[PDB]
Chain A
C-alpha cells in the first residue's frame, strides 16, 4: 500500500447496485466502456513498462531517526552546548506537531465531503479530535512570538501550571 490506513481512516464503501427502470440506454455506461478501453488500458500499458524498469534497479531511502537528547529543563543556565541540542530538538518537535494538526484537519475535511448532506452528524469523532489537538497545540505553541524558543515555551508552561495549582488549591477552600 501507499499510505498507512490507520493514520487516514476510511469507512468501507457501499456502492448501491444499479437497477434500471427505463427502456432507454444509460449513456454513461457506454462511455465508461469507451473510456476504460481508449484511456485506461493504454495508460496502464505505459505504466507497466515503466514499472518493470524500476524493479530492475531497486534502491532504498531511509526515514532519518533522531536520537533523544536532554530537554531545556535539564540544562544549566547559560550553557550553550547543552542548550543548543535541547533547543534544536524542540524545533523538530514543533515541526512534527504542526503536521499532526494537518493530519487531523485533513481527516476532518475528508469527513465533511464524504458524508455529504449528513456531515453535521456523522462527523463527530473527527471534530472531537480536531478540538482535542487544537487545544493542546494552542497551549504548547501560541503567543510565543516570531523569536520563539524552548525557554519561552518552558516559561509559558510554568505560567499555566502555577495558575492551575493555585486554582486547584483554592477550589477546596470554596
Chain B
C-alpha cells in the first residue's frame, strides 16, 4: 500500500503497519535479534523511531482512554485538594513567640542610627 499521494515526498515507499518492533515474535530466529528484522525485508519508514529503545505500541491491559481519565483525575483532584489545604492551614494555639531587645533589632541587621520604636513584652 503506497503512502497517500499528498505531495509530501513519500513516493512509492511501502506503508507498513505502525507497529513497534517490540510487537514481534521474540523467539523467532531473527537475522537481527535486537532490531527484530530480516535481511531483505522492507524497513518501516519510521524504523529508527520504533526500535526497542524508543516508542512502544504493545497492547496494554487497561484501555488507553481509561488510563488517561484516571491519571488526570488523580492529578486534578490532588492539586485542588492542596489549594484547599493552603487557604485553611492547621496551626496550633500559640502566640507571637517573643524576642528581646526590640525583637532582636541589632541581631537582625538593625541600623543603629534612627533607633526603632521601643517594643516590650510583659509577663503572663
- Residue ranges of A at the interface with B (Cβ–Cβ < 8 Å): 118, 120-121, 124
Total count of chain B residues near the partner, CB < 8 A: 4
**A117 CA / B109 CA spacing, docked (Å):** 12
B12 within 8 A of A: no
The 5 closest A-B pairs by CB, nearest first: A120-B109, A121-B107, A121-B106, A121-B109, A120-B108
A-B contact count (CB 8 A): 9
Across-interface contacts of B108 in A (CB, < 8 A): 120-121
Across-interface contacts of B106 in A (CB, < 8 A): 121
Measured CB to CB, the nearest residue on chain A to B111 is: A124
Interface SS of chain B:
loop
**A171 CA / B107 CA spacing, docked (Å):** 38
For residue B99, give the distance in angstroms from its CB to the closest CB of chain A: 14
- A120-B107, A120-B108, A121-B108 are known contacts; what are 6 more A-B pairs with Cβ within 8 Å? A118-B107, A120-B109, A121-B106, A121-B107, A121-B109, A124-B109
Q: Mark B10-52, 1 if CB is under 8 A from A, else 0.
A: 0000000000000000000000000000000000000000000
Measured CB to CB, the nearest residue on chain B to A117 is: B107
Across-interface contacts of A118 in B (CB, < 8 A): 107
Scoring B106, B108, B109 by chain A CB atoms within 10 A of each residue's CB, the highest score goes to B109
